Every structure is written in C-alpha cells, then in structure tokens.
Amino acid sequence: GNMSFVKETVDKLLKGYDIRLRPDFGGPPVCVGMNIDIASIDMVSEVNMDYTLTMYFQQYWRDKRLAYSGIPLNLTLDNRVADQLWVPDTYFLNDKKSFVHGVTVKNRMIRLHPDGTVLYGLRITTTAACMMDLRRYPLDEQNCTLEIESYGYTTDDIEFYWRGGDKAVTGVERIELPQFSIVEHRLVSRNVVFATGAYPRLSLSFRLKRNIGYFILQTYMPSILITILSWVSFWINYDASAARVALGITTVLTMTTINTHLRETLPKIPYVKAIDMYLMGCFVFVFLALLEYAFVNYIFFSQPARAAAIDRWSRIVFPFTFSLFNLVYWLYYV
Amino acid sequence: GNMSFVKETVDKLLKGYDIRLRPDFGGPPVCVGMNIDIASIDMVSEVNMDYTLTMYFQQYWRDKRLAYSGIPLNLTLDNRVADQLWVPDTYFLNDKKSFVHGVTVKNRMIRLHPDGTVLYGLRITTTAACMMDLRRYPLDEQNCTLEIESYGYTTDDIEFYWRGGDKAVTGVERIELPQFSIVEHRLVSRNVVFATGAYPRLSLSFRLKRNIGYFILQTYMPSILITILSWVSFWINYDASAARVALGITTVLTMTTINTHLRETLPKIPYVKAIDMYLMGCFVFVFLALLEYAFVNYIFFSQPARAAAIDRWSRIVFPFTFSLFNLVYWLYYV
Amino acid sequence: GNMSFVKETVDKLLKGYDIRLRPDFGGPPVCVGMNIDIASIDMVSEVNMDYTLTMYFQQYWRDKRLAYSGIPLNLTLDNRVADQLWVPDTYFLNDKKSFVHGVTVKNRMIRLHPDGTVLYGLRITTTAACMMDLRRYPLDEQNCTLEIESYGYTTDDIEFYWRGGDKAVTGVERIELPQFSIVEHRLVSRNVVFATGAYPRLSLSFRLKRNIGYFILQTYMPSILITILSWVSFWINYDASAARVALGITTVLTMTTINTHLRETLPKIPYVKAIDMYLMGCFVFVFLALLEYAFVNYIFFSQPARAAAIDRWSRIVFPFTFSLFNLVYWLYYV
Amino acid sequence: GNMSFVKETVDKLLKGYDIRLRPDFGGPPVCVGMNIDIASIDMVSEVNMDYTLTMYFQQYWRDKRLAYSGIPLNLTLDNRVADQLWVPDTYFLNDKKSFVHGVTVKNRMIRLHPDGTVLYGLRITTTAACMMDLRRYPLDEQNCTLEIESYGYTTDDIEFYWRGGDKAVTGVERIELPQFSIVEHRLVSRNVVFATGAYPRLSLSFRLKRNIGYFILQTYMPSILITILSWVSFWINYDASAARVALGITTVLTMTTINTHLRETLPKIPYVKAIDMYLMGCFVFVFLALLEYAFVNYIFFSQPARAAAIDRWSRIVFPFTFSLFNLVYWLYYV
Amino acid sequence: GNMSFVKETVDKLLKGYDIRLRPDFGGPPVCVGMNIDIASIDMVSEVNMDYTLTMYFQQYWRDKRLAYSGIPLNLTLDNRVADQLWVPDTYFLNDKKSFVHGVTVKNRMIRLHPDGTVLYGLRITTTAACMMDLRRYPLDEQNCTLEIESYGYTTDDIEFYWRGGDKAVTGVERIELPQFSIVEHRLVSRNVVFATGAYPRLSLSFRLKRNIGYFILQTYMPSILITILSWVSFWINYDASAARVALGITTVLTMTTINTHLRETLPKIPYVKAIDMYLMGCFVFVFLALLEYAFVNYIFFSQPARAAAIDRWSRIVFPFTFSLFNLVYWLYYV
Ligand SMILES: *[C@@H]1O[C@H](CO)[C@@H](O[C@@H]2O[C@H](CO)[C@@H](O[C@@H]3O[C@H](CO[C@H]4O[C@H](CO)[C@@H](O)[C@H](O)[C@@H]4O)[C@@H](O)[C@H](O[C@H]4O[C@H](CO)[C@@H](O)[C@H](O)[C@@H]4O)[C@@H]3O)[C@H](O)[C@H]2NC(C)=O)[C@H](O)[C@H]1NC(C)=O
Ligand SMILES: *[C@@H]1O[C@H](CO)[C@@H](O[C@@H]2O[C@H](CO)[C@@H](O[C@@H]3O[C@H](CO[C@H]4O[C@H](CO)[C@@H](O)[C@H](O)[C@@H]4O)[C@@H](O)[C@H](O[C@H]4O[C@H](CO)[C@@H](O)[C@H](O)[C@@H]4O)[C@@H]3O)[C@H](O)[C@H]2NC(C)=O)[C@H](O)[C@H]1NC(C)=O
Ligand SMILES: *[C@@H]1O[C@H](CO)[C@@H](O[C@@H]2O[C@H](CO)[C@@H](O[C@@H]3O[C@H](CO[C@H]4O[C@H](CO)[C@@H](O)[C@H](O)[C@@H]4O)[C@@H](O)[C@H](O[C@H]4O[C@H](CO)[C@@H](O)[C@H](O)[C@@H]4O)[C@@H]3O)[C@H](O)[C@H]2NC(C)=O)[C@H](O)[C@H]1NC(C)=O
Numbered sequence A, B, C, D, E: 001g002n003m004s005f006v007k008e009t010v011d012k013l014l015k016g017y018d019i020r021l022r023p024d025f026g027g028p029p030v031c032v033g034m035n036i037d038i039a040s041i042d043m044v045s046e047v048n049m050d051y052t053l054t055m056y057f058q059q060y061w062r063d064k065r066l067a068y069s070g071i072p073l074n075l076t077l078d079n080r081v082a083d084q085l086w087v088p089d090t091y092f093l094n095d096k097k098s099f100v101h102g103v104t105v106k107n108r109m110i111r112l113h114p115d116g117t118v119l120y121g122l123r124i125t126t127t128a129a130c131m132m133d134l135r136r137y138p139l140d141e142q143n144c145t146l147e148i149e150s151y152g153y154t155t156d157d158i159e160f161y162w163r164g165g166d167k168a169v170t171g172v173e174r175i176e177l178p179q180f181s182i183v184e185h186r187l188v189s190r191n192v193v194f195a196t197g198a199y200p201r202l203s204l205s206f207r208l209k210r211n212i213g214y215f216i217l218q219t220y221m222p223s224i225l226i227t228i229l230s231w232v233s234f235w236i237n238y239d240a241s242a243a244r245v246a247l248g249i250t251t252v253l254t255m256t257t258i259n260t261h262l263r264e265t266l267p268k269i270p271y272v273k274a275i276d277m278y279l280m281g282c283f284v285f286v287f288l289a290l291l292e293y294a295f296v297n298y299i300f301f302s303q304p305a306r307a308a309a310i311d312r313w314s315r316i317v318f319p320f321t322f323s324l325f326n327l328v329y330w331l332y333y334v
C-alpha cells in the first residue's frame, strides 16, 4: 500500500547484501527446486544432431538475508533488480547455443516472499545437442535429453531437486512435432562425481518416435513400383530384344534417379541406414533382372527351350525373392 | 519556452522515482492500451513454421508519479529516458527471435502528458511460430497468431486492452504477401489462468489463404499432361512392341523425375499432403497403363481378338477413371 | 589553440547540456540537412525481396547551445562524445536489418563548428526491403527505395531537407551490380500526415533494370533448340514408328528436365512469370507435336494420303505457330 | 562460517589490487597450468576446413596479491568478480569464431585458495580452422589442432604448461562424430620465437580417420554396377543395333547423372579427389565400351568374322582392364 | 621494477589525459605506422563477391602526453586500458562485416615505451568486398584489395605509412587457398581527396589466379566426351534409323543434363561466362549433328548417293569444326 515504505524495506534488504556470497554460506547446502514449462519444441535436425527447445525455466530457493516482515504481499519485483541478487549458477550441459529473449524486455522474473523464499523465472530458447543413432532410420526412435547442472558449486554448497516431482515439467502434451511424436518424458535427479567432487544433476529426457507414413508413401512405394515394373520384361517375347533392353535399362535409370534425388533431399548423415539398405536391395534386384534377361538373350539362339524355361522360372523367382527380402527387411527393422 | 524550467521539472519527476514500483502499486491494476501498426510481413517459412513481422508497438497508460504542471506541451523525451521510467513487462508468447531496430538510434519513443499519461513506442521485428496443418496444402488456409502477455505481473496488477477497439491494429491492407493473401484479422482480449494465476492476453490473429495459380501452372498441369501422354500407347498397334514399351517407360521416368524435383523444390515438410496424393495417383495411373500394355502383349499371341478388345476397352476406361479420380480429389480438397 | 584550453571549452559546452531536450525547444523546428555517399549496393535478393546497402550518412544541423568562440578550428571529436550530445532520431522505414560498423572503432564522426553547427556521420550497412513485381521477370524493371524519417518528432519540431539539392547523394555512378544496371535515382522530400500529426520524410529511390543476356543464352535458347528438335519427327518415315516415338518422348523428357532445373535455379517466388509462361508454351508445343505424330500413326493405315497430308501440313503449321507464339510473347513483354 | 568476516577478507584482497599489472610484475614469469575437458566435437566441415569444439578451459596459477589466511575454505566466488582480478591473455591461434555460453549465467568460475592460488574456468564453444588435403578423400586422414598462445605477454612474463602431465586433457573418448573416428590426440608445449620475442605455446592435436562404408554403399557400388551393365552389350548379337545403342547410351546417361549428383552431394571443395578419379575412370570405361560397339557395327558389314572376334575379345578385356584399374585405385589410395 | 611505483606512474599518466584530443592536437599531423600479419584467408565467394581474412593489425605511433620516465622496461597493459587512451579512427573501406575476436579476453594489446611510443594490436577477422569479374571464368584472375583509411581525421591531422616498408605485411606465403594461388601482393600509401579534404589511404592488394585442373577434369572433359559420342551416329548404317535417332537425342539429353547440373553447381553469378559459352558451343554442335542426320534421313530415299556422300563428309567436317572451335576458344582465354 505504501510505495515509500516498500521501497525502504527493499533498500534495507539490499543494503549489506553481498551477491558474491551464496545464501547460507558456510552452512548446509541450499536446496533449489526447478520447474520447466516447455512452450514448444522448435525443430529437430539430424544433420546437426540437435533440437531447439523453448521453455520457461524457474528456480526456487530460500535466502535468509532476503527475509522481510511487515509486508504480507508477495513482491514480484521488476526484472532489472535481478542483477542485485545471488542466483544459482545453473546451466545446461549440452546446449550448443542458448539465449534469453529480450523483447520488449528481458524475459526474466524475480519474486520475493516474506519467509525469504525467492522464485526466479526465465524464458529460454536453447539448441540442445542430441546424438542420434540412425541405423534404423526412418524407423528410428530417438531419446533426446536436456541436462541441468551447477557450474561452480558442489553438492556440499547446493543441491538440485525437481519441484513438483513428475509434475514439475509441463507442456509436453501440447508439443506439436510435424515429423515426430513424443512418446514419454522422464525426469531424473542425481549427482555426478567429477574428480573435483560431487555436483547436482537434473535430466529431462524425451523419447521421440518418428512418423513413417510420409516415408512409406514418398520413398518406399516408388522403389517398390519400379521393382515391380522391372518384372514386365519377363512377359515379353524374346525376339523383341529392343523393347526388353529399353525397359530394363530405363527402369535402372529411374531407380538411379530416385535414389540420388532422395539422397539429395534426405539429410547428409554419412553412414548406413535402413532406407539405404532397402534402396540398394531394390537396385540389386532390378540389376539382376537385367542380367538375367541378358543371359536369356545370350543362350537364346543355341537353346531356345532352356531360355524360355529360364524366363518362366524367373517370372516366379524374382517376385518371390523380392517378397522374401521385403519380409526379412520389415521383420528386422520392426 | 524556458529549457531550464523543463529540465528542473524532469529532474524533479525522476528524483525519488522507483522503477521497481508499478504505477498505483498496491492498488487497482493499471490498464494498458496497446496498438500495433504493422509495416509489412516479411516471410512465411513453412519449413520452420513461422512468420516474420515488423510493427510499431505502442503502449499507453497512466503513471501518477510522472504528472507535472505548468507545461501544457507534451514532453517527447529521448529514448534513453525509457531506461529510467517504468514500463510494462510485455512479451510475445509465440516468438522465436525478436529484436528492436536501433539505427540510427534505438527506435524507441517516450511521450509524457501533463496528466501523467505515458506513451511508449517501439519498432519491433519478430519471427512468430505458427503451426501449420499442411494436409490440404497448397489448397490450404492457415491461421497464424500473435500472442501478447505480461511475463511477471498478473491481472491483479496490470490489465491489457486494445486502445481503439478494433481500430487498434492498422496496416493490414498494406501487407502485401506475394504467396498468401490476407483474409481476416481478429483482435482478442482475454485472460488466461495458469497455475500461478490470471494473466491478461491480447491475441492478434490473421487467416491467410494460399494462392494456387503457381501450383496449377507449374505442378498439376505437367502431371496431367504426362498422364495424358501415357495414354498414347493405346492408339498403337501391338506389333510396335518397342514403341509402346519405350513410350510407357519414358512416361513413367518423366513422372518420377517431375515428382522428385517437385518434392525437392517444395518445402521438405515431412508428411503426406494433397499434392503428394495427386502425384501418386497419376504415377499409379501410368503404372497401370504400362502394366495393361504388358498384359495385352502377353495374351495377344493366344487370343489376339481378346487382346485387341482389352486395348480398345482401356482406350476409354483410362480417361474415365482419371476423370473420376480428379473429381474425387478436387471435391475432397475444396 | 592550447590543448588544455580546448579541453576546458569542450567540457564547458558539455556542462549543463541536456541530451533529452532538442535544440530550439518550444520554438522553431530544427532543420536537419542530410547527405548520403553510397559505397556499394551489395546484393539485390528477389527471394527475400530486399537489398543490402552500405553508405555514409551525414546529418548537418545548427545548434545554438553548442556555439563556441575563440577557437578558429572546427573541432573533430571522438565518436565516444556523440553519446553526450543530442542527435535527430533518424531511422529508415523499411530496413529489415541495419547496423553500423564498429571496426576498429565505431564508424561515427562528430564535428563541431564555431557557429554552433554540428556534422554527424555514420557508416551504415542496411538491408532495406524492396517489394518486387516479377510478372515480367526476367525482363522486369524494379524500383527499390530507401525511406528516411524522424521517429518521435513531428514537422512542428524537426524538418528534413537534402543538403546539396539533387547532388546531396553521391557515388551512385560507382555502384556495380552483377545483374542490374542503375538507370536513375531520385530524391524526394515531403511530409506524411500520420495519426500523430505530420512527419518529415526523405525518399531516395533507384530504378534497376535487369540484365537479359544471361537468361537469353541460358533459358530461352535451349528451349528453342528442343522445340526445333521436336519438329525433326516430321521429316521422318512414319513406318519406323519406334524412332519417332523415342524422339518425341525424349524431347518431352528433356524439356521437363530443363524446366524443373530452371525452377530449381531460379528464385522460388510462387506466382506467374514470363519465363514460366515461355517454358510452358514450349512444353505445350512439344506435347502437341507428339500428339500429332501419334494421331498420324493411328490413322496411317486407313488412308496414307490423308496421313501424309496431315504430316506435311504440320511441318508448316508448327514452325509457323511457334513463330507466332514467340512474336506474341516478345511483344507483350517488351 | 562468518559471512561478514569473509566479505571483509574478500574486500581486503581486492583492496588496491591492480588488474593492469600481472602477478610478480617485473619479476619471474608467472607459470600458468592449463586443463581442457572436452565436452563434444560438434562438426567437421570440409567446405570451410573448420571444426567446432566445446570444452571447459581451466587456468591454474598463483598471485601473491590474492593470498588470504585464517579462512580454511576455498573461496568459490561469483563470476562477476572475475572482472576485478587478473587473468592470463590466453587465446586460440586459429579460432574463426568462439564464444562463452551465458545461460543461465556466463559459465565462468573463480576459485581462490589460501596460498594465493587461483583457478579460473570457462565453458567455450569455438570454431577452429583445420586445413585439409582431401586428395585421398574419402580415404583421407586429417590432423586438426587447437593452438593456445598469449596475445600480449612473452615468455619473460608468463609460461604456459600442461597441468597434470598428459592427463591435462580429458573427454577424448566421449567425443562422438558421425563421420570420423578419433585415432590419437597429442599435447605439445613449447615456445615460439617471433620478431618481438618468445611466446609460450600449447597445442592439442587430433588425428581423425574418415569412415569409408557409407561411400562404398552409396557411390562406388552404383558405378561398378553401371560399368558391369555397360559390359552387357558385349553378349548381345550385333544384329540388334538399336538394342546395343540404347544400352550403351543409356548407361552413359546414367553414369553422367550419378556423377553429377554425387559431385553436388559431396563437399564443394574445388580440386581433384580420389572419388573424382574413380568416377572419371568408370566414365572412360563406358565411353570405351560404346566406342567399341560403334567400331564393331561399322566394320560388321565388311568382315563379320573380325567384328565377332573384336566383340569376344572385348568380353574378356573390359572386365580385365576394369579390374586392373580398380586394383591400381585401391592400391595407390590405400 | 616496482609494482607500486609503476601503478603511480600509470595513474599520473592517465591523470587529466583527454581521449577526445588527438596527440599534438592542432599541430603537426601524427604519423601512424601500420603492420598487418595475415593468419589465413578463409574463403572467396563469387556469389557474395567477398573474401574472408583474419589478421593481426598493429598500429604504431607516439603520444607525448603518455611519455613516462624512470622505467627503462617497456610496459604492456590489459586491453581494457585501451578504453582510456587515444587510438586512431582507422577502418577498412571495403569491408562488409568485421569483428574483433574476444575469446578469452578481447584479442587486444596495448604496449607503451619510455619515449611515449604506443603499439596497439588487434586480431581482426573481416569479410572484405572484392568486385570479381568472371567473364573469363574459370580461367580468370582476380585482384582483391583491402583499403585502410581514417574516418574523421584528415591528412592535416594524421598520416598513414607502412612500418617496415614492403616487410610491413607478413604471412602472405603461409596463406593456403585450395581454390586459388597467390601470385603477388602490393602495398600503396596514397592520399584521397574527398569533398571534406585529403585522407590517408593504405591499400593492400592481392592478385589471385584460379586453379583450373578441377574444372578440366570435372567440367570440360565430360562435355568433350559427349561431343565425341555424338559423332558415333556418323559410323552407323543409315538403315538403322531408330538407333541413330536414339543416340542423337540421348546425347542431346545428356548434354542438357550436365549443363543444368553445372549451372546448379556453379555460382549463381548471373552474366555470361567462358564456361557457359563453351557448353553452349558443345550443345550447338550436338544439335547440329542431330539436325544433319535428320536431313540425311529425309533426303536418303530420293538421292541415296548424296546421302552417303553427306554422311561420309560429316565424319570429318564435325570433328574438324569442333577442333577449330576448341582451338579458337582455348587461344582466346589463354
Ligand atoms: C534416455 O536414456 C537415458 C539413459 O542414457 C535415460 O536416463 C536413465 O533413466 C533411468 C530410469 O529410467 C535412470 O535410472 C535411475 O537411476 C537413478 C540413479 O541411480 C544411481 O544412483 C543410485 C544411488 O542413488 C545407485 O544405486 C545407482 O547404481 C546409480 O549410480 C536411480 O535412483 C533410479 O532408481 C529408481 O528406479 C529404480 C528402478 O529402475 C527403483 O528401484 C528406484 O527405487 C527408483 O525409483 C533409476 O535406477 C538412469 O540413471 C538414467 N540415466 C542417467 C545417465 O542418469 C532416459 O530416461 C532415456 N529417455 C527416456 C525418455 O526414457
Ligand atoms: C485462429 O485460431 C484462434 C484460436 O486458436 C482464433 O482465436 C479465437 O477467436 C475467437 C473469436 O473469433 C475467440 O472467441 C472469443 O473469445 C472472447 C473471450 O472469451 C473469454 O472471455 C469471456 C469474457 O470476456 C468469457 O465469457 C469466455 O468464457 C472466455 O473466458 C469472447 O469475449 C468472445 O465473445 C464473442 O462471441 C460471443 C459468442 O461466441 C458473443 O456472445 C460475444 O458478444 C462476442 O462477440 C469470443 O467468444 C476465441 O477465444 C479465440 N481463441 C482463443 C483460444 O482464445 C482466431 O480467431 C483464428 N483466426 C481467425 C482469423 O479467426
Ligand atoms: C519509385 O516509386 C516512387 C513512388 O512510389 C517514386 O517516388 C515519387 O517520385 C515522384 C517524382 O518523380 C514524386 O512526385 C513529386 O512529389 C512531390 C511531393 O508532393 C507532395 O507534397 C507536396 C508538398 O511538399 C504537396 O503539394 C503534394 O500534393 C504532395 O502531397 C512534389 O513536390 C513534386 O512536384 C514537383 O514536380 C511536379 C512534376 O512532377 C511539378 O508539377 C511540381 O511543381 C514540382 O516541381 C512531385 O509531384 C512522388 O511524390 C514520389 N512518391 C512519393 C511517395 O513521394 C520514385 O521516383 C520511383 N523511383 C524512380 C527511380 O523513379
């Protein structure tokens, strides 16, 4: 109610307050509770192995030196006063690049409570590093984490606990990933023992299961249809060598074009993937079909009956072998 | 007219002023009237799901600590004095990267009125996230919003409203996006009850309808023409096996190439859209035409009359099926 | 010319000087002459509809409060003194991203003259926004401007004029652009009546004409060559249908490939372009050629005389129709 | 355990501490031990010949001006006090771009010991430059270094050394790169004599060996298969001129397409590489095959026995010559 | 060397020192000797027409106001002290983005000598604009200059010179450009008479000659081979019309594909280049070959002897004309 009285109280609290000293200095470690409200996951990139995360990050502790009485109201002070208070040396272990928004002001909130309780909130957009195993891509299921740790202090000086247990991290439900779909998020709290000593550690881990419909429609289906078309050559009269040659080589060319342009579109992740195995299997299949036709034409003149027998045998073997290969591929990667 | 008198008045007003105290602290919430004058909309990135906007953002309120007498003319102060007054902690809920233009000086305006009225203007460019459902793309209509909220204060301390009813936001017609076309913009003034409590909320949302002519001329028309060309093989005698084989397979190759180049040129949004269904339908059609020719060629030796009848049936079946497919597609996506 | 005396005079002038108060407060508006010396127009990006510019921008204005006497020289002070003066709130209406170079120091020059006049120069690299009309691309003629306006002051307080008349802008001739040749630059001074009174406005506009040689040699010529090659099928014995089918379909494939690759190379602005119209016209022509050949081959057995007549008439019509289409295209767009 | 007593001790330590003077200024050089704990290696781009690194950098030394007695605790101070001390002018010789993360605070640790020993830690993400000789790419083996030097001081003022011997650098094993695989890291400590004087110099070097399986699967195998397909025309009766013409020319087109697409997908370093030699060799082989068929067709009508002999000799020579070329390629570059 | 005495000396020197006043203000100009030690040149971009350069920039002058006595040893100070002295307003005329490396400390050095001599060192990376002409690309040879000039002061107040003559710039030998090869570097010390007076201007120019082997292997050789293959149709019996038509049209397709892929790979610089003329020439050659064959086929039935004569004449005319064109081209650009 009295602006001047509140100002006097705040100035008295700030007077004699040494920001260079943590609260309860020389005593038991000060516990800090952390709450994360994930506004949205911006973008996941396999090329850079990173995901952009936008969130509200709030820390909660108690500083005795800041305890004040006579004003029952919680004091949500202006952000600019935050520079005048001790704050935890919280940082994210695996953020490649992070920043705090500043429009129209720094997205920063300080709230004091009569018992000396301090609440400090930030709005952070951080690009965290998530190493991914893409052997089973695009049928992959990644597990991307965000780590939180104190920088200078140890467990003897500061301890981290999740504020609210499994309810501490909110907003997972409303996250919209156009390509992925969040399956499960977990919170872990523990201590990491470096050679220097023990440090607090908090981990927020999501598991993301990748959508597959787009890759089935746009990637696998063209290859399957090209492989099927390659078998048209079998039901062709052997005398019409020109048409069979044109069909086989054109299907091979189409397979090469789709493979290379998919590689161009798909991320440049340099190692083997399931999609690569399937595409090379289809390519080997069409190549073998053309080779079989060449063998048929070669032995066609000497033993036409054996050539016809080979052609009709391939008419069954090639679709059968392709189906068997597809069954093996789907079982292995599902 | 006396600059010394004005300087004395300003020094008196700033003397003892506490930036940490909102106007009428401990009393009624302070009303804030916000206006946005949009300069232009830069880009609408579907890949990153965000739009870039530039606007003059003005906040209007009253602070009694700044009321002065004797000077009828309003005080248009330098932008640096804004660092010494109190300003609302306005922030944007769905922004990813925003900044204030500072050339040549920071684009910040402070205007004080004799009755303590304060007007505070910025020139802000922001990249606001906007989740897009591109299933009906490119025939889709999107709805991109901009949310404005007080980061620290609650509805008990501050209240937002649009200064000027629905005339608060201007320049919508002056926006000229080459790609989209603005349909309707709405201003919403509400309250949101988070776990902490109630916050004001001002939402300015546009609905954009994507222009279609470019995709009609550049994407659908070539696919339709290739589909039509695939039907040429029907008006060919079965003897010209090489001719029909080459025609069908080259139409298939052309379809694949145009599909791949459209996929690469179009945004890499990795899920099924309308255009992809259309392209796969056309590809299925050319595949079926080639397969039909193969079947006719195989059965022509045994039952030439039956094969000729099947071909002449296909001559009309294929265009009819394609027309039905197009009708179904263009009803399902209109 | 004593260094200590000069320092004392400068301190005295800065003593009792209020930055927040404009000169001639509550009196005549302060005139501000402006000069621009353009160093180099970096790039003109059509995709982002913007252009990068680098220039020397100088503001020249009288100031009674800074008048000094007894020193004949015009003081040239460090940039770090400019923060202690009053400067006009000049900004640019349509700069997406503008900044001032700061290596090895801020490119800011302050010069004071005994009569109280002040010269203030900056070196600025600004990315201005230029909305382009590409309906006649690449034969377009853009008009890209730069607007200069006061931010918080009105014409009742500050006036902008081009100091030097039509010569106030220099270095336009030395500008070099890979794709454009500057035709004409214009300077305009006016006052724009916003809601909050009038505002001074200085517009500097350029008209840019796009070079056509690269597009002619790289886009239109190959399309014309393939169009001509389409007619080759006309001077072919129709009995050998396989060769003609291959020729027509492969010309269509080549046309599609070049069209897609030009789409990939050319900017991705999604609407109608003259180049697009030309490419679609050529594609339509080759498609019609293949269709005519198919119809001739179909009717070749009913009456060879009619087929030969149709073929020989096509040999005349298609070059004639193509020439007429080219005439229409080059006359409509020029 | 006395807060005010420790504050007094810290103020006394900072009382008269001159930052601008090195410890023991004018006396023996101050030995500085350095440790690096590498968090991760972000990426290794050959396009810019640079790799991004992130690590904790710790400097350990002694300053007599910062020695305290009576307080057994190691004073772990706030980061903001680091600006009031002296720290070595350590810098990296080849950092194109580097920064210190500031979320949630600048990751800067200051720790003081009773004996005046100071430990100073930073979390640095940098972009080191690493020139690469990719002639043997993708079978290359890069040597990428990070060099550390004093910017202003000489060996007479400061002497860098590795703290704790070769164990000064940790986290090498935890580094994971999708494409490479660390073989060995080395630490070098020395002095470098310039014209001005001798500078201490530290060097941390990595030897990265590139993974080869991805390119075997993606690039070499398609080319080998295309070469084998080109060989097919040898086992084709020379009467089928159209068949062999189509086969050879289509194989050439396929080789061109894969060559161009692989050149685009691969990094754009503009000089010769082993993979380029391999692709040009395959192109040479397919060109020779088509030329051989052309010669056989030309001489076929005159001396058919000679033409058949040439074809059957090509049947053996071409696979043999290709095997020899592959042997040369996989012996020289391995 | 006494710490307290040195600190007293430094404080005395800074006592009353005015940064805004240049040394010998109002008197003779102060000569500045500048050395540049180039560490590396990152990249040269034709798309942006600029080169990235990292260097040590050392200025050398004398300010008697800072002259000290009694300390024979030279002094080296923390970079922060540079904020309290006078330094020249040096800048680079043709830069686009420049920054002083600031890890760990700002890469800045200040050294003082008893005679008042000041040495000032920066570690600067800048992207300098170099207007590159690429008519003769890739056989071109560029001349890229970095200009250095004062901003506010003129030749009356300050003069620029190279400290070390032609040895002022070092490290040019160590520069490693994979794309280019440094041929010569020159230093000039001109004066420029702008409308505001005469300014010093130190120019450092490089001449870079582009390495060409990569383009010969990857760009010219495929075109030559395709042109050669286009002549295969000449050694084909005219009866086999299908084979020759397919060969010609497919060679045209391959030429178009390689030209388009080169366009995509080559920098988007939109004006005619030597490589474009060469590719257009090759394309015209294969187009004329196909046209000649078509004319031969048309005239074959009426005058078979003339057709045979034309076919046998082309086998020499086309290779001879192509060799003549190649001679003209490779003599024009070499
Ligand atoms: C992505 O992948 C990471 C791993 O790389 C997953 O993170 C792991 O999650 C599991 C749980 O799912 C964690 O396991 C937990 O470890 C805690 C710490 O254990 C240490 O300390 C204790 C003493 O305090 C020692 O005894 C122990 O040996 C370790 O040194 C435990 O306290 C937890 O116990 C809880 O669960 C068990 C049952 O599993 C119960 O019996 C307990 O009562 C208690 O409830 C638990 O064991 C593991 O530590 C995490 N890894 C790391 C490195 O911390 C992510 O979960 C995954 N992402 C997703 C979305 O799942
Ligand atoms: C893009 O998509 C967004 C949603 O994602 C759309 O935003 C919605 O816009 C509509 C209006 O078009 C909003 O509806 C309005 O909400 C107001 C606020 O309601 C709250 O407060 C009132 C009290 O003030 C409470 O009674 C109520 O329970 C809420 O707590 C209402 O005041 C508005 O009332 C109007 O309509 C009613 C009838 O429905 C009339 O009786 C009233 O007189 C009045 O005319 C209205 O209901 C909606 O809230 C917005 N969504 C969200 C999440 O807030 C955008 O409109 C869309 N883009 C475009 C271009 O349409
Ligand atoms: C790119 O496109 C822009 C427009 O989008 C062009 O800018 C226009 O340029 C023309 C000149 O070529 C400008 O026309 C001039 O406007 C001046 C301002 O008029 C206003 O203000 C005055 C008071 O100051 C009012 O009286 C008046 O009603 C307006 O409100 C006039 O003063 C000029 O008049 C002079 O020339 C005319 C003949 O043209 C004479 O009759 C007059 O006596 C006088 O000498 C003139 O009319 C126009 O205003 C500009 N646009 C804008 C928005 O300002 C660029 O030129 C174009 N780029 C290129 C390269 O051409």
Ligand SMILES: *[C@@H]1O[C@H](CO)[C@@H](O[C@@H]2O[C@H](CO)[C@@H](O[C@@H]3O[C@H](CO[C@H]4O[C@H](CO)[C@@H](O)[C@H](O)[C@@H]4O)[C@@H](O)[C@H](O[C@H]4O[C@H](CO)[C@@H](O)[C@H](O)[C@@H]4O)[C@@H]3O)[C@H](O)[C@H]2NC(C)=O)[C@H](O)[C@H]1NC(C)=O
Residues within 6 Å of the ligand: D143, D144, D145, D184, D185, D186, D188, D189, D190, D203, D205, D206, D207
């Ligand atoms: C990537 O490439 C870099 C080079 O570009 C490699 O770095 C080199 O590593 C070697 C070691 O493997 C370094 O060699 C060492 O140099 C030290 C400095 O030499 C000076 O001082 C000595 C006296 O101490 C003088 O004799 C000498 O003339 C110099 O003035 C030496 O001190 C080292 O000596 C060690 O080995 C010798 C035997 O060879 C022993 O007798 C010594 O006791 C001692 O153990 C050693 O010679 C070399 O200097 C590094 N290069 C540079 C430029 O410094 C990287 O190793 C490479 N990457 C990988 C992964 O290997």
Ligand SMILES: *[C@@H]1O[C@H](CO)[C@@H](O[C@@H]2O[C@H](CO)[C@@H](O[C@@H]3O[C@H](CO[C@H]4O[C@H](CO)[C@@H](O)[C@H](O)[C@@H]4O)[C@@H](O)[C@H](O[C@H]4O[C@H](CO)[C@@H](O)[C@H](O)[C@@H]4O)[C@@H]3O)[C@H](O)[C@H]2NC(C)=O)[C@H](O)[C@H]1NC(C)=O
Residues within 6 Å of the ligand: E143, E144, E145, E184, E185, E186, E188, E189, E190, E191, E203, E205, E206, E207
């Ligand atoms: C890239 O291209 C630029 C030009 O665009 C080249 O820069 C030129 O470099 C040459 C030197 O290589 C410069 O020529 C020299 O200029 C000096 C300054 O001239 C001014 O000052 C003198 C008085 O001091 C006046 O007389 C004169 O009018 C000018 O006002 C001269 O002092 C030099 O003279 C010396 O050499 C000449 C022969 O060249 C002798 O005859 C003289 O006796 C004397 O020894 C000389 O003329 C030229 O000015 C530069 N041009 C520009 C625009 O800066 C770059 O060199 C080129 N890149 C590379 C790698 O070469």
Ligand SMILES: *[C@@H]1O[C@H](CO)[C@@H](O[C@@H]2O[C@H](CO)[C@@H](O)[C@H](O)[C@H]2NC(C)=O)[C@H](O)[C@H]1NC(C)=O
Residues within 6 Å of the ligand: C073, C074, C113
């Ligand atoms: C100081 O400023 C005055 C005022 O601009 C300069 O006087 C001008 O001098 C030029 C020639 O150099 C004349 O063409 C102008 O007409 C003069 N203007 C006026 C108002 O007198 C003077 O030259 C400047 N001197 C210095 C050393 O900068």
Ligand SMILES: *[C@@H]1O[C@H](CO)[C@@H](O)[C@H](O)[C@H]1NC(C)=O
Residues within 6 Å of the ligand: B002, B003, B004, B005
């Ligand atoms: C302005 O007010 C000051 C302070 O009262 C006074 O000293 C001065 O004379 C006044 N000047 C004018 C022009 O009114």
Ligand SMILES: *[C@@H]1O[C@H](CO)[C@@H](O)[C@H](O)[C@H]1NC(C)=O
Residues within 6 Å of the ligand: C002, C003, C004, C005
């Ligand atoms: C010039 O200034 C110096 C320093 O203040 C002073 O000692 C000297 O007397 C002055 N001389 C004149 C002529 O003003």
Ligand SMILES: *[C@@H]1O[C@H](CO)[C@@H](O)[C@H](O)[C@H]1NC(C)=O
Residues within 6 Å of the ligand: D002, D003, D004, D005, D008
């Ligand atoms: C703690 O420090 C305060 C302030 O210096 C002092 O008054 C008090 O006596 C000290 N107490 C002890 C036990 O050192």
